RNA sequence: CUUUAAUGUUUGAUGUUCUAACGUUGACCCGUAAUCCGGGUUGCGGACAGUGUCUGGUGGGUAGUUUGACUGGGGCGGUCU
RNA sequence: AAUUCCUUGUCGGGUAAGUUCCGACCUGCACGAAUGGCGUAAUGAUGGCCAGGCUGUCUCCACCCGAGACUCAGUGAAAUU
RNA sequence: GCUCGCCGGAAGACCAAGGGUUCCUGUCCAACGUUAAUCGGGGCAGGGUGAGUCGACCCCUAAGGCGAGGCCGAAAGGCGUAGUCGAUGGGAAACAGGUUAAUAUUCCUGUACUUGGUGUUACUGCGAAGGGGGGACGGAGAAGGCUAUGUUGGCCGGGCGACGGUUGUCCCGGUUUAAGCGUGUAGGCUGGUUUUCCAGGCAAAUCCGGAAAAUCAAGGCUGAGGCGUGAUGACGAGGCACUACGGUGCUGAAGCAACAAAUGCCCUGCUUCCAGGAAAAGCCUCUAAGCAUCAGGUAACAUCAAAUCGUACCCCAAACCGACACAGGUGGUCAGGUAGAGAAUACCAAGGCGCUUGAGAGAACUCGGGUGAAGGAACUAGGCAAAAUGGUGCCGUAACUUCGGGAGAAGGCACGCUGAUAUGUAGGUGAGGUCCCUCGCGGAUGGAGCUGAAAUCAGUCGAAGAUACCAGCUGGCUGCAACUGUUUAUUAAAAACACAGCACUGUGCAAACACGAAAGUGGACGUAUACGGUGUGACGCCUGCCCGGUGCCGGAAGGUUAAUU
RNA sequence: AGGACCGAACCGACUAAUGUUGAAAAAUUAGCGGAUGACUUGUGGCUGGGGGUGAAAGGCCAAUCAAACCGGGAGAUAGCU
C-alpha cells in the first residue's frame, strides 16, 4: 500500500525552499503574510 | 528487395520488410553527426501541439548537403548508408582535394561514381546545375525555392519534378502532387530521380512495429463522451452529426488555404 | 423633348509598367568569441500582402438564461376570457 | 438471430421427461453491405450446451486433529440511551 | 546452563534514500510497553563518530531552470542570444593483520600509490578563446579460456568410545594469506617505413584528410588468468599460568595435490539483425598572435602540501511511508551442503529467532484441516467449492488449415536396490619420460593419476519404486472479437478501447493544424512514397439503387442588400 | 528468429472463503494472467483547474473530481425545516 506522501529534502527545498519563494513575485507575498502574523518557521528550511 | 516473412508468429504472419544489401553495415561517419532529442510534441509552453507523437528508438542527425553548393571539384561516391531520420538512403561522397559529405542518394547511383556541380557540369544523374542550364523536359530532384537556399522539393524516395515550360526569368514545373508552380531560373536542382523507390512496398506487420517509430495509439472522435469530442456520446452507436475536427471544423471537403502572398506563383491546383 | 455624334469638366472601374513606402523564416560584412537582435551591401516581391477604426454574413467553439398552472400522486388527454 | 412482440412458432436430433442447445423453414412486429455484409485456421482468467474420469456438492450425515467459544488470574473498549 | 522448535534466495549480512542520539556504560520502575518487570528503542547522568586514497566539495556536460543586451506585452510580466546553474552520466590515487564497553580501508603494525609547489643538474623552441584525434556508447546469440567457490585425496594435531563391533579401506578438526611490483600468456584488432605534392580542415601547420612513387615484410596496440616477489612476515589446531571464573599473557605442528565449476572476468571482444543506438571536459597532437642569452618544455634527485564538511545507530525494518511496538509498501549488492533442470521445492550450515498475556477444561456453534460404508451431480441459477490429472525416455496421434499449426491432441509401455559386460564402459581432464626448438607462460609424441553418464543381461524386496515436497483434467457442437496488448486506484477486465490493414479529405513550405492579446514554439532540423483530421478494423469473396431533405464544393446573367457619399 | 511455448524473481488482479466497531480507511489464504517486451524499475525534469493528461472508464490530478485545495466577496440567498 503505496502512501501519498514518499520524502526526500532534494525536492523538498527545490519547492517550498526559501531561495524558491523569493524568485516569483507571488512567493514573496507568502513571506510577506507569515512574517505579519509572526511565524517562528518561514518556511521548511530546516 | 521485398522479402515476406513466414507466419512462425501471430505478429509475423503479415510483415514485408524491405531490404538493401549494399547499405553500409558499420558505423555512420564521426564528424558529420549531431545530436537531436525527441520532443513528444510538447512545445516550448510545454503542452501537447502534435498529437499521437512520443517514445521509439534513439537517432543522430546527419548533416546533409542540400546546397550542393562547392563547384568545379568533382567527388567519388564511398558507400551507401540507412539515415534513420528520412525515407531515402544517403551517400557518402569524398571530393577530390580531401573532403567528405553526405549527400541525398538518387536512382541508379553506386560506389564509384562520379558527380559534378555548378554551371559546367554535364547532364548526368546526381550532377546539379542551375535550371537555366537544364534542358526543358527532364526530370529532377531536391529543388530550390530562392537561390542560395538549399533544395527543398521532391526530396522523399522516389519522387521526382518535372520541367514542364521556361518563360523568360521563370521555368514551370510539375511537382508529386500534380501541381504547376514557377520558380526562379537562377535555382539549382538535380538530374534524376531520388533512390528507396521500393519503400511505399513495405507492411510493418504488428501493433509494436509503429511505436517503434514514436507513433501512439489515436482514438476515434466518436469513441469519447460528449464534453471531450463534438462526435462523442451515445446510448449505443449513434453519430447523427456533420464530421468535424476535434476543435469543430469541417474535416471533409472544406479547404484550408488562405495565402494571398504566393498565389501569383501557383499557375494550376492539384485538384 | 425622343433618338444621336462631336470639342471640353467630374471622376468610377480594367489591365500594363516603374520604385522610393512596406515584406523577406535568400546571400554576404560588422558589433562579435553569438543560427537571437541591430546596422550596411545585394537579389526577389511591391503599392499587393498585412495591421487599426467602422461595417454585412457565418459562428453551441464559449457564456448567461428560459422552458406556466389546474390535476382524486406526476406524465399523456382536456381546460384557462 | 447479442435483433423475432405474438412465442415455450413449426419440423428433426439429443433426454424416461429439454422455456436452454445443434440443424432447417420463412410469416424479417423492427437484418443487410466501410455507424461495413457473409465466412474464417490459430488465440481467450470470453457467453451457451453435451460427454468420460472424479468426488461429502447431495441422499444423510458420522468420527477425529488444531484455533476461539466455556472456568480461573492481570489489563480493559463500542455503537445505543 | 542443558534440551526442544522455526527461517535459511531469509525471518542471514552490506549499501542508498529517510530519520537523528534510538548507539555504550551506571542508575530508577511513577507515567509509556495491550499482562507482571529486577527488563526496554522508557526517566536521569556520563561517554562515543579521528581520512592525501570512501562520499561530498571540485573540473565537465544531458533533460531542464535562470538570463546582461534583445523581441514582445494595459501594468504585473512572456520568450530568448552571449553566458551561468543543473546527475540519475564522464575525470588521480590503499591493501592485509591487530585493537575499544561503544569508531575505524579513518587509530596502530607492515608493504604501497596519485596529483601539484619549490630547489639543483642536464638537454631542448615554447605558446589558444583556434584545427585534428580520442573520450564515444544498440538488441540478441554462441563458443573458447579462466577465477570465485566446492568435493575428494595427501599432510599435521587429537580419539580408541555409556549398549553388540570399532588399530582400521575407522572418527573429529585444520590445511589461510591482500593491494603493489616483474613477467606479457589464452586470445582480440591492425600491414609497417621513407620521400614529393594539394582547390580541403575559416588564417598557419611538421597534425588530420587526399594524391604519386620506392622499400620491407613483420612491426605495433589491447589483454583475463598463471608464475616469481610482497612473505625468514602475519594467521593458525592446540597446549600452558593465573583469574578481580569476564578474561589477560607465552608458545604454536601442517599449511600440498587432483577433479568439478558460475548468471562473475577476458568481453566496450566475436557473429548477426534493423528499430540504426548521448554531450562536454580530463588526455594526445598541431600551429597563429607574441618571446626569443628570457620565459617556457622533457628528464633524474631532494623536499613540501593535499584544506573544509559526513563518519555513532536503524541493514526490506519496533528507529523509513502507513495516527500504533500496525499480518501492508521500500531501489541495489552477497549467494555454502545433499536431492533437483533450477535463484522452484524438502532438510540443514554461518547467522538469527520462538512473533510482550498466561493456567485449565475438552459442550452447542463458528473458522482451518483428515478420513468415510452403498450410490455418483440425484445438489444448484450454474459441477460454485472440493475431488481428480501432474516427471523423464520411447511408441502413437483425427476433422480442419492462412501449410506455421491443431498437438504435450487422444492413448500406451518402462522407472527401486544389487551383480556382471567393465576388479569403472563411451567420454572429459591430464603428470612423468622422449624428441625438436627461433629456447619459451614453446611444439609434437606419450600416457600414470583423477572424474565418469547411459544401456543390456541376471537376481531381489514391498500392497505400492515419477513412493515425500514439487508437478496439465480431457474430448465434441456453437455466439463474439482476427491475434500479444489497454481499461472504470477501492462492487463492471468484457463482445468495450487500441491494433497492423483500407478509404475519403486538407496541406507547395513563412505548409495545413495546435499552445499563445504578441514575440515565439511544436509539426520538422521533415518536403506529397511527407504531415494533419475523420470513419472502418487481420485475412478470403464483395461493397448494389437514391442528390428530393441537411451539409459541403464550383459559377455569377438577373432581384434584394451594410458602413460610405 | 519470435509483440514465440512451459515456468521462479518482477508486474498484475479472474474465482471462492475469512475479515466488515478488521491485523489492514481495499488486506490475508488457496488456486490465477504476462513474464525479451506496445515490458518493468531508480533518480531528476516538464504540462495547473473551465485547465492538464487520457490504448477513452467521465478515468486520474496528494485517502477529495460531471470541474482540485487554501484564502477572500461573505453574516451570498433560503416564499423551506
Ligand atoms: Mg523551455
Ligand atoms: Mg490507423
Ligand atoms: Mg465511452
Ligand atoms: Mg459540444
Ligand atoms: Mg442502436
Ligand atoms: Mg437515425
Ligand atoms: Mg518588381
Ligand atoms: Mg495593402
Ligand atoms: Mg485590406
Ligand atoms: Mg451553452
Ligand atoms: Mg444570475
Ligand atoms: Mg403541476
Ligand atoms: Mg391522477
Ligand atoms: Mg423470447
Ligand atoms: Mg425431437
Ligand atoms: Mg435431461
Ligand atoms: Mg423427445
Ligand atoms: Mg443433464
Ligand atoms: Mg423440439
Ligand atoms: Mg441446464
Ligand atoms: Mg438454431
Ligand atoms: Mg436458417
Ligand atoms: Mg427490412
Ligand atoms: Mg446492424
Ligand atoms: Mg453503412
Ligand atoms: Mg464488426
Ligand atoms: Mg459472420
Ligand atoms: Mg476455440
Ligand atoms: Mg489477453
Ligand atoms: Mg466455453
Ligand atoms: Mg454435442
Ligand atoms: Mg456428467
Ligand atoms: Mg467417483
Ligand atoms: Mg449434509
Ligand atoms: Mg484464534
Ligand atoms: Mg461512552
Ligand atoms: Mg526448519
Ligand atoms: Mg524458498
Ligand atoms: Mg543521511
Ligand atoms: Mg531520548
Ligand atoms: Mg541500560
Ligand atoms: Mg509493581
Ligand atoms: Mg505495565
Ligand atoms: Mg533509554
Ligand atoms: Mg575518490
Ligand atoms: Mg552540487
Ligand atoms: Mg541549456
Ligand atoms: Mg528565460
Ligand atoms: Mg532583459
Ligand atoms: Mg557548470
Ligand atoms: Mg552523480
Ligand atoms: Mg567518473
Ligand atoms: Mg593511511
Ligand atoms: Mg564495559
Ligand atoms: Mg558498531
Ligand atoms: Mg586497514
Ligand atoms: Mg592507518
Ligand atoms: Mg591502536
Ligand atoms: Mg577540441
Ligand atoms: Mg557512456
Ligand atoms: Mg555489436
Ligand atoms: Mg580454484
Ligand atoms: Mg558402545
Ligand atoms: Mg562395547
Ligand atoms: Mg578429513
Ligand atoms: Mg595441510
Ligand atoms: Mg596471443
Ligand atoms: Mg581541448
Ligand atoms: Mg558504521
Ligand atoms: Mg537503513
Ligand atoms: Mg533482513
Ligand atoms: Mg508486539
Ligand atoms: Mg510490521
Ligand atoms: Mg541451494
Ligand atoms: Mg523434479
Ligand atoms: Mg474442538
Ligand atoms: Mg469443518
Ligand atoms: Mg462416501
Ligand atoms: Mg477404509
Ligand atoms: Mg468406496
Ligand atoms: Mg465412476
Ligand atoms: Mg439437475
Ligand atoms: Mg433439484
Ligand atoms: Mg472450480
Ligand atoms: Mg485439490
Ligand atoms: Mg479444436
Ligand atoms: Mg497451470
Ligand atoms: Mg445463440
Ligand atoms: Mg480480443
Ligand atoms: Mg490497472
Ligand atoms: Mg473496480
Ligand atoms: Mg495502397
Ligand atoms: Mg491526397
Ligand atoms: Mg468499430
Ligand atoms: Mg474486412
Ligand atoms: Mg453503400
Ligand atoms: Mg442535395
Ligand atoms: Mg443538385
Ligand atoms: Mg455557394
Ligand atoms: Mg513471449
Ligand atoms: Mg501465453
Ligand atoms: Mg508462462
Ligand atoms: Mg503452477
Ligand atoms: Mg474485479
Ligand atoms: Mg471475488
Ligand atoms: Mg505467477
Ligand atoms: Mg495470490
Ligand atoms: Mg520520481
Ligand atoms: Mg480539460
Ligand atoms: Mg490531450
Ligand atoms: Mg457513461
Ligand atoms: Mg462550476
Ligand atoms: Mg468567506
Ligand atoms: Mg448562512
Ligand atoms: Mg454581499
Not at chain 2, 573532403?99 to 544523374?125: C, F, H, M, N, T
Not at chain 2, 518535372?162 to 514551370?172: E, F, P
Not at chain 2, 469513441?223 to 456520446?233: L, S
Amino acid at each position: 500500500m503505496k502512501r501519498t506522501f514518499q520524502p526526500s529534502v532534494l525536492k523538498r527545498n527545490r519547492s517550498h525552499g526559501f531561495r524558491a519563494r523569493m524568485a516569483t513575485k507571488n512567493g514573496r507575498q507568502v513571506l510577506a503574510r507569515r512574517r505579519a502574523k509572526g511565524r517562528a518557521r518561514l518556511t521548511v528550511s530546516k | 528487395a521485398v522479402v515476406k516473412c513466414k507466419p512462425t508468429s501471430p505478429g509475423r504472419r503479415h510483415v514485408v520488410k524491405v531490404v538493401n544489401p549494399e547499405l553500409h553495415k558499420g558505423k555512420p561517419f564521426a564528424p558529420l553527426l549531431e545530436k537531436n532529442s525527441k520532443s513528444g510534441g510538447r512545445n516550448n509552453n510545454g503542452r501537447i501541439t502534435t498529437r499521437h507523437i512520443g517514445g521509439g528508438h534513439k537517432q543522430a542527425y546527419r548533416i546533409v548537403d542540400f546546397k550542393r553548393n562547392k563547384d568545379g571539384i568533382p567527388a567519388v561516391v564511398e558507400r551507401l548508408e540507412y539515415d534513420p531520420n528520412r525515407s531515402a538512403n544517403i551517400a557518402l561522397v569524398l571530393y577530390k582535394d580531401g573532403e567528405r559529405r553526405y549527400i541525398l542518394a538518387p536512382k541508379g547511383l553506386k560506389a564509384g561514381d562520379q558527380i559534378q556541380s555548378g554551371v559546367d557540369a554535364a547532364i548526368k544523374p546526381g550532377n546539379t546545375l542551375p535550371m537555366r542550364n537544364i534542358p526543358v523536359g527532364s526530370t529532377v530532384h531536391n529543388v530550390e525555392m530562392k537561390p542560395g537556399k538549399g533544395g527543398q522539393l521532391a526530396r522523399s524516395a522516389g519522387t521526382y519534378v518535372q520541367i514542364v515550360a521556361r518563360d523568360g526569368a521563370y521555368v514551370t514545373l510539375r511537382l508529386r502532387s500534380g501541381e504547376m508552380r514557377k520558380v526562379e531560373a537562377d535555382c539549382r536542382a538535380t538530374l534524376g530521380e531520388v533512390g528507396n523507390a521500393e519503400h511505399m512496398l513495405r507492411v510493418l506487420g504488428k501493433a509494436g512495429a509503429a511505436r517503434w517509430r514514436g507513433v501512439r495509439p489515436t482514438v476515434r472522435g466518436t469513441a469519447m463522451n460528449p464534453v471531450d469530442h463534438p462526435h462523442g456520446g451515445g446510448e449505443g452507436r449513434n453519430f447523427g452529426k456533420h464530421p468535424v475536427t476535434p476543435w469543430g471544423v469541417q474535416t471533409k471537403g472544406k479547404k484550408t488555404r488562405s495565402n494571398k502572398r504566393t498565389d501569383k506563383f501557383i499557375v494550376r491546383r492539384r485538384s
